[PDB]
Amino acid sequence: KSYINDKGKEVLVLWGIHHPSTSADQQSLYQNADTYVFVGSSRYSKKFKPEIAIR
Amino acid sequence: VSSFERFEIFPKTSSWPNHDSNKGVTAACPHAGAKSFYKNLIWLVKKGNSYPKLSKSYINDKGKEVLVLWGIHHPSTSADQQSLYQNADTYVFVGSSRYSKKFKPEIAIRPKVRDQEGRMNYYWTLVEPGDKITFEATGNLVVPRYAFAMERNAGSGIIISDTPV
């Protein structure tokens, strides 16, 4: 899903990445043992990877 | 910089017999309309339909610190990854006496910037005299072509103005 800045001002966008404690938790919430997250814009480019471990 | 000399660290015509050193052009860096690329860098692609594991080393033999620049390309789609390097999974490692880092391409589509949806991350390091720099990759590597031997002068800055010289 994409959004285009249409308000004429700089837009502050906040998002979070969740790191599950166990592999069962990973499958319990997202159903995929392996997942990837990518956020991209005209200047920002980074791909995230969940780190599944108990803290 | 006290002294600045340009020597061909990795010659284009003889350093990459297993990889294509002439298809590395794109529409984002044009020259006289035709697609071109950075003159000091070579965008190595698969030579036909094969990209064997690449390894080539240079030893600083000029007596001065050598500035080496290289880039890492992140394809937009998996088809693009197989179209240029023939390997869905590739790794890039650069190692010297002090530098040690392994890169991993991040394949994802980005918003178009100069008609490009892929990203190219550039890197640099300094090689002291009597040191060797080693390049290792199975793909997604932009090999250097020209290197600079230099001696930094302590201090000085950069002036940003339209005043003539």
* Closest CB to B108 among A41, A42, A47: A47
Experimental resolution (Å): 3.2
Residue with tokens 């390894």, as numbered in its chain: B55
Size of interface A-B (CB pairs under 8 A): 17
Token pair listed for B14:
């003889």
Q: Cβ of B111 and A38 within 8 Å?
A: no
Residues pairing with B5 in the sheet: B149
Buried b (16+ CB within 10 A) or exposed e, A13-44: eeeeeeebeeeeebeeeeeeeeeeeeebeeee
Task: Decide: helix, strand or coil at residue A29.
Answer: helix
Solved by what technique? Answer: X-ray
Gap from A5 CA to chain B (nearest CA, Å) = 13
Q: Cβ of A40 and B108 within 8 Å?
A: yes
Q: Which of residues 5-44 of A touch B (CB under 8 A)?
A: 38, 40-42
CA angle A51, B106, A23 (to 5 degrees): 20
Nearest to B145 by CA among B53, B37, B26: B37
Q: Quick count: other Cβ atoms within 10 Å of Cβ B135?
A: 19
- The H-or-E segment that residue A25 falls in is helix A23-29
- How far apart (Å, rounded) are the C-alpha atoms in residues B142 and B54? 11
Buried b (16+ CB within 10 A) or exposed e, B68-93: bbbbbbbbbeeebbbebbbbeebbbe
